[PDB]
Amino acid sequence: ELLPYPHQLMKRLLNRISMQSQLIENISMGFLDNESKLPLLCMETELERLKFVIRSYIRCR
Amino acid sequence: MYYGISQFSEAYNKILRNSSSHSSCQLVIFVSCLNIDALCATKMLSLLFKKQLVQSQIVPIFGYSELRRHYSQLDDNINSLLLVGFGGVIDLEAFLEIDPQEYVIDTDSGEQSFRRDIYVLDAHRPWNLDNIFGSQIIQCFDDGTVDDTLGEQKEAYYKLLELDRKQRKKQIHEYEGVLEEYYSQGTTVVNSISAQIYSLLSAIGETNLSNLWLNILGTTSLDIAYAQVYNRLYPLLQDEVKRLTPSSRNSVKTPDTLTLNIQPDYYLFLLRHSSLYDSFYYSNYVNAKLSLWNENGKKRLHKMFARMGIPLSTAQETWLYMDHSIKRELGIIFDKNLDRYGLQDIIRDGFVRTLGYRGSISASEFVEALTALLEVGNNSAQKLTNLRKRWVSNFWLSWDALDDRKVELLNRGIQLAQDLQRAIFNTGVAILEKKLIKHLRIYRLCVLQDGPDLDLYRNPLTLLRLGNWLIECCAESEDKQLLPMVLASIDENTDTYLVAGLTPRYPRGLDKKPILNNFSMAFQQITAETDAKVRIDNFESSIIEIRREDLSPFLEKLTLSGLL
Amino acid sequence: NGLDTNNLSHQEQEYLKEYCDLITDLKSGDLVDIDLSGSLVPPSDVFIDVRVLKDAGEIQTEYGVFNLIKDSQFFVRQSDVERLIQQGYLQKI
Amino acid sequence: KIYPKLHQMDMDKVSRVYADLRRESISTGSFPITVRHLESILRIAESFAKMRLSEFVSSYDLDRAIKVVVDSFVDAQKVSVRRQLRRSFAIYTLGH
Amino acid sequence: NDDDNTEIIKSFKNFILEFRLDSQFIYRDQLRNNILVKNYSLTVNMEHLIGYNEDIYKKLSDEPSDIIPLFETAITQVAKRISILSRASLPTFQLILNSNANQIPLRDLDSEHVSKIVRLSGIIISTSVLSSRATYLSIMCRNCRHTTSITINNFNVSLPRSCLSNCGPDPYIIIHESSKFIDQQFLKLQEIPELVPVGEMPRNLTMTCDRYLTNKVIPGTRVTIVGIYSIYNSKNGVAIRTPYIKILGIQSDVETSSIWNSVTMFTEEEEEEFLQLSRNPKLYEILTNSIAPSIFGNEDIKKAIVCLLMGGSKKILPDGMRLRGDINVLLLGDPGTAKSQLLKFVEKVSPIAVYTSGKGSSAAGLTASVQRDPMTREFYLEGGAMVLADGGVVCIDEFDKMRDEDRVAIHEAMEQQTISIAKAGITTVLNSRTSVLAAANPIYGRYDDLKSPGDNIDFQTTILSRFDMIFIVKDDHNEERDISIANHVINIHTGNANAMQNQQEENGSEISIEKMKRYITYCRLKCAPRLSPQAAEKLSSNFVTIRKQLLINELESTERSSIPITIRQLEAIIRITESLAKLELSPIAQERHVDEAIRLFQASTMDAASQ
Amino acid sequence: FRKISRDRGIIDKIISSMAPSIYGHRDIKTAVACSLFGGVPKNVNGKHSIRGDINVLLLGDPGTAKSQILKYVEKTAHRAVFATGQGASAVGLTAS
Amino acid sequence: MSLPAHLQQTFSPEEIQFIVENEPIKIFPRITTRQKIRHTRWQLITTDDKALNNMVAMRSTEVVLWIALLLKQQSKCSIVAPQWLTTKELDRKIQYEKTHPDRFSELPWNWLVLARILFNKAKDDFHDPIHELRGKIQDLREIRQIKVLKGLKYLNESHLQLDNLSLLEINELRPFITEIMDKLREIHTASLT
């Protein structure tokens, strides 16, 4: 079956991807001026892992 | 001086500070292809920058003409360069057309900084002084040569740089006299580039068995031509194998155990991967002691196997299938018998790696495989370029064969090495039977005009295999005077000769101060004097190309040259 | 075409255009933050070694600039090169 | 023991010899000169290098072989054309 | 002694269970994969056995006949552990060996090798019927009726001389109902032609294989064997006994398929190379230049040899009428034109072929001969060159020097694709579906182009009509062509052509013998193309033009033509039209194939008849 | 052998030594010398092969040492076989 | 269509890896990120951020498996294998499997997937010698494959029960079990009036 769409869940996640992707860019402006880079690497690879689940979800439906 | 051995951590931390970001690629490594030591150095250095997450690009380069082309087109965001295996002996600031005023930033204070660093990882000498003293952008790494050897040149360089009439005549010709003696030294390799990067990994605290194997491979490649250097470094490699090898002994073999032993590694050709007969027949050293090109030399080989008590039918079995009793008795058979033939020097201890159940490879056998991948792994401007593209393409076959996941590509290499050494031998006998080595008083000349599969010898490395075979052969004969040798080979398609100048060397067991390749000056000085067409663009500047009709005029002025 | 026309009937040459235009209308809107035409192989991989398989010189891409010199190798974040891998300029993974 | 190789400096001589031998073999009852008779000049040149016990065919072996093959072709012709053929082939018959 | 065998067995169970490279337990996995498809065997590569524990290889190679049957039981014990639940049967597994030990030339086998594992190679000249050996005898006593059994392993045992518990001196009979048996086959292997010493007849071994190695070969295949060189006490000298090989691993060199009902033995890594190659826009140029690359010119003969290697398509009507799909070609011509060098090439590219000389041949030696078996004293039938070449090409060189009684035996085998026999109370029609490629000279050696074109040719219209393309290969003495050949031939002798043929293969302008043999073998199994309805409109309008042309040429010549056009030659142009569609793996044949098939027929049979 | 092989004119010494008791016929002695040493047999990438042996036809008048030249080569060659006219069959040559 | 054919009704093994990488794993950090009372910070949105900003070298902690593998790719972590990846606990499960033909043992849903990930990425962090762990993971893989082949003799129009089968062992069987039970259902429902 085509299951019913998670309306409020999807609006929430598409906010957090927009806010988090702005945050990763803002933190990359501090690096122009400790200064350890693992949390930047994790915040970026988490958005790739999350954007994949939503793309794979929408492409499926 | 520029970065001494004590201060490689500062040069590395400077790379991290300048060129680490998650935003962009910022680091470029230019590596000379056609150099195994530069390959093993660059493999270690990439595993390091992988672990630090430094985004980087590796570009293999054939020669100086391609160095200018690739440098000319670097994206201006690239702010660190490593030049691995070349450029120490050329003025890089002049050659690349740098003016530091176009590179300087934040000049304030007794201070400078620059938008690019150029770090030179090179083992060749004599160092160009305008790199080692005369530049702030070029940043050489050192084994110790500068502080130990260059103190008179340092002083002469600065007093001449400051001095932009008796009191002047009395001094300007003293200091130019010191530089003029410092140049007018022949070329030599004095260290491995891989042992330099392993001493950097030792400063950072990154050493492990994978980096140690690449250190052993890179350093072993010197043994054929710079034996005097392999023997300095070999004691230091033994200590690191002990330091990193785990506690267990009388250990059970399991698919997961890597063992990197120090054990007998006889000076024979591809022993563990060929027969015991082909091991002797195709060895440079054996051929040199037995005179094994002519059929009385082949009799001396059979007469030796018969006296050792190994049937020819057993000696010719592939070493895996050769019987369990011979393979453990072999240390005793050689320690009894080799002395009769003077082959005693074949007994050697070396590094032997075995992984799981897949059977041992020695560092010697592994570099024979990796070189065979560089050599044969796959309108004259197109005819050169579509050939130099092939030698850049082969670098990635040798690179991928350093990975343990890719043993099938090492096994390609081990088959190709046995195809090459057979062709070298079948050509080397033709030279010695037909008397093609002419004695020209100052040097020995050899010129391959025609022959079977002659189209191999247009790769600079394959010409140097045949060079090292003819050199070992001469260097053991007690009547010949040691003389520089010139080895030339035609390409019938480009219509040039590839010409290589070779240093002789002392017999493999005698134990002197080194001798230096002064063809690198003699070819430049004769080239500057003549109107002939040549290429002087190779990184091993003992090797040149010349159009067919210009060769005899060139050699005619080489014999007159006082520079050899 | 999200990233042979002789074989198609004219209605199919037309339909393929109208459907490529529909795909770009979905990703050009809300839901733009995820590249819907992107890969369905999961991102198990962070940085990758990639070997540049064809010469293409200096090229731009949204995230940065590469000089795609024949048989140079890059170690770079998978998410930057993934479209160049798909176009076949790059090799490995 | 001996198996001689070729230096490839022969190309114009052997090709003109074969072209001449074929062109003069238009005569009706003449010897059947064929590609297996070019190939013969190359076999005979290798046999002379074996007699000198050499691993390489010289241009003197290629001349002796062309002389043997041309002389044996010309001697098979009728007296009515043997003069014309000796006169035509002189650069190859008098080569050794 | 059975403490010692239990340790040898335990040490090989642990080879199967522990041997690993990378993540994968390659012998546990191979056992399970073989159990599911129900072949109870394991192939072991001996480099891995040496890699695990060299003492085991030492034990094995010292006395194979006593250690191989201990590794077979170690395999069965693992096979139970990995495929049956304990505490909730399989036969004895075969061990098959792969090796890279040095090949011993077949004539160098001698007393030094008795009982050793020996690797070698040769041409299979014969295969027997299957025979049954026991692996388990059920047993019962004649007198006291005690019952037991004997497990048998077939290396280097017999019925017991004592009742085991007077009961008598030879007490036991075999209960056949409860016994179990295995297949055994005898081969004969001749040595390879390029390894026979000067002036000797090629030497021969008999050898035996059993279980999953039976039926793995056919006569004419070139094979490498691993086996135990060993001895048997035949009744056929003094203190003397006959050598043979117990075969432990056949390995056919080119994947020549053996006894094979067209089954899908290809692998996806080569099938996807062929399926790209089919779709190359230049494919017919590539295959034409890959035929005999050292032979200059002869371009149409190479184009026709490519058609002959594919054949057309075989058809079977609701009538029951069978249509020939195989193409036959005649190279009739002047001396030294590469006719025999092209036959010696098609013998090597074709996946099955036989080269023969018509002067060295008989009717019986070509088709099938009646032999008399010296033991049964019965007659039996043996296949000649046409039966050996079945499904392939027979190359008949010197076809003009064949006797008139021998040439006629070929007439059935060229059209109806059978060999009928009625001799010594045997009668059969044997199948023999081959292409014939033949080479010949005219009467008077050269073509004598001024003489009548029927007075040059010896052959009757009965045999000439059985050839689909006849090439009259005239040699023409044009000086520009003779220089172009002279330069080419010298480049072969001087060794330049070797490097050029290597460079053209690397350039993709040419393909190797091994690749081409496997491409031909694939096309024969994936395509049998039909004519499109528009291809019939062209082939009909053409063939009636060819007959009008012939009738006019006969009216000038005042006689029946010696080279005919007949309806068997319409089917030749149809069959060529299909061969060109098999090349590119087309499911159908089209107007572009019909244009090239009419062109090749014009350049061969019709320009040969026109003379 | 190595010493004499570098005699200037070794070919013409060896040719003069073919059937040394038969006078003249230096073209036959030359042809016999070439056939008796042979050329080099060739195989090309494994695909193709070329004949290295040299075949010779002594055609001519009676009582001219054609048969004595052949009976000398039977003494001189390593492995040799002699056959004659009506005494030789299709499969006494060849094989049966 | 929008979704490739080989994904239309099932997960790729790489998607089954991606699902398993979302689980918590215990680690020993080799970095102290914890700031003292006497700097960059993680700020994640799919997992608990409060575990990573509080790392202290060599005191164990739990993190999501895809972060443990990303830290272990540098020297910056070591991954503590679960209790069931011990030669004791694997050998109790092998005994359970042999003892109960009728059932699969209570291994966790991800056991093959997690064994394959950690043997490649964390090969040095096992207390037992990894060649005996690989050996027992294979012993378990093979026994469960026999029990699966026994289970397929019962394909049905109504249902099956497959209690402790792993996600990777379900995912290989999915396009066979469901495709055959679908045709058994179509053949059955067709017979009904």
Ligand SMILES: Nc1ncnc2c1ncn2[C@@H]1O[C@H](COP(=O)(O)OP(=O)(O)NP(=O)(O)O)[C@@H](O)[C@H]1O
């Ligand atoms: N076109 C050619 N290109 C290359 N080699 C050729 C060519 N024509 C002839 N030769 C060579 O010359 C010889 C010809 O002999 P062969 O191939 O046996 O001739 P043939 O056509 O069968 N003549 P024949 O048996 O006399 O009717 C071989 O060694 C060939 O390789």
Ligand SMILES: Nc1ncnc2c1ncn2[C@@H]1O[C@H](COP(=O)(O)OP(=O)(O)NP(=O)(O)O)[C@@H](O)[C@H]1O
């Ligand atoms: N040129 C010659 N020099 C020396 N003796 C010769 C010469 N020609 C012929 N003889 C001798 O005379 C005889 C004839 O030679 P023979 O080989 O028998 O003749 P032939 O040429 O084969 N003639 P034929 O048999 O009739 O065809 C032999 O005894 C020879 O030794």
Ligand SMILES: [Mg+2]
């Ligand atoms: Mg022929």
Ligand SMILES: [Mg+2]
């Ligand atoms: Mg006579």
Ligand SMILES: [Zn+2]
């Ligand atoms: Zn009894």
